[PDB]
C-alpha cells in the first residue's frame, strides 16, 4: 500500500502497527519550544507521565537555555528516562517556534526513541488576548 502522511483515524480499522501497538496506544512526547527555553515531557496514551526534561533542568542558564544544543541535550535526557520505562516509539507534539523546536526532536532520536509522527499544536488565537505592545529597537 502507498504511504499516507495522514494519521490513522481512531475507530477505523488500520493495518499499521508499531511493536504490536496501534497509533492510539503510542506514547506522546510533548515538546514546548519557547523563545528562551525548551520543555519536553513524555506521557503514555493514558496521560501517565513517564519523563520530563528541559534545558534548565540540564544545567543551562539564561541565554544558553535558548539554544538548539541545549534543547538537543534536554531531549537526550528525557529519552533516557523514558526508554527505561519501556518507550521506543513516540508521537511528537511540538508547540512553539523556539530554537529548540527541531533540535529537541533530534535528541529524542539520538536517545533511542523512534518518532512515528509529528504534530504541531502551537496556540493560535482566533481573534483571543491582546499581545504585549511592540518593542522600539
Amino acid at each position: 500500500t502507498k504511504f499516507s502522511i495522514y494519521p490513522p483515524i481512531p475507530g477505523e480499522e488500520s493495518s499499521l502497527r508499531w511493536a504490536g501497538k496501534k497509533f492510539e496506544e503510542i506514547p506522546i512526547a510533548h515538546i514546548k519550544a519557547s523563545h528562551n527555553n525548551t520543555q519536553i515531557q513524555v506521557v503514555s496514551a493514558s496521560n501517565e507521565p513517564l519523563a520530563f526534561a528541559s534545558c534548565g533542568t540540564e544545567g543551562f542558564r539564561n541565554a544558553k537555555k535558548g539554544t538548539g544544543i541545549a534543547a538537543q541535550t534536554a531531549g537526550i535526557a528525557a529519552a533516557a528516562r523514558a526508554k527505561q520505562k519501556g518507550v521506543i516509539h513516540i508521537r511528537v507534539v511540538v508547540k512553539g517556534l523556539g530554537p529548540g523546536r527541531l533540535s529537541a526532536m533530534h535528541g529524542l532520536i539520538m536517545g533511542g526513541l523512534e518518532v512515528i509522527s509529528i504534530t504541531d499544536n502551537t496556540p493560535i488565537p482566533h481573534x483571543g488576548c491582546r499581545p504585549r505592545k511592540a518593542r522600539k529597537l
Binding site: 502522511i5 495522514y6 494519521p7 526532536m105 509522527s117 509529528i118 499581545p131 511592540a134
Partner: protein, 86 residues
C-alpha cells in the same frame, strides 16, 4: 481543546526520516499562513499598521504578478537572431 487530537497539523514519519516529515509539516504550516501568523502575533500590530502592511502586500503581489506576466510575454522573442547581419 474540544476537538479530536492528532488530526490537525499532523504528519506521519516514513522510514524513520524525521527530517523530511518535519520539512513537510513546516511547508504545510507555511502555505496555510500559520508561521507568518504566529510571528506577527508575538507583539500587537495596531490596526492602522495592519491595514498599511496588508495594503502594501496586496499591491506588491499585484505588481509582481504583473511583472512576471510581462517577462513571460516578452521572452517569446528570446530566440536566436533570424536576420543576423541586418
Amino acid at each position: 481543546a474540544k476537538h479530536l487530537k492528532f488530526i490537525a497539523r499532523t504528519v506521519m514519519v516514513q522510514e524513520g526520516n524525521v527530517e523530511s516529515a518535519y520539512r513537510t509539516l513546516n511547508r504545510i504550516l507555511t502555505m496555510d499562513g500559520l508561521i507568518e501568523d504566529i510571528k506577527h502575533r508575538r507583539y500587537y500590530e495596531k490596526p492602522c499598521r495592519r491595514r498599511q502592511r496588508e495594503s502594501y502586500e496586496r499591491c506588491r503581489r499585484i505588481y509582481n504578478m504583473e511583472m512576471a506576466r510581462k517577462i513571460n510575454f516578452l521572452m517569446r522573442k528570446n530566440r536566436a537572431d533570424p536576420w543576423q547581419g541586418c
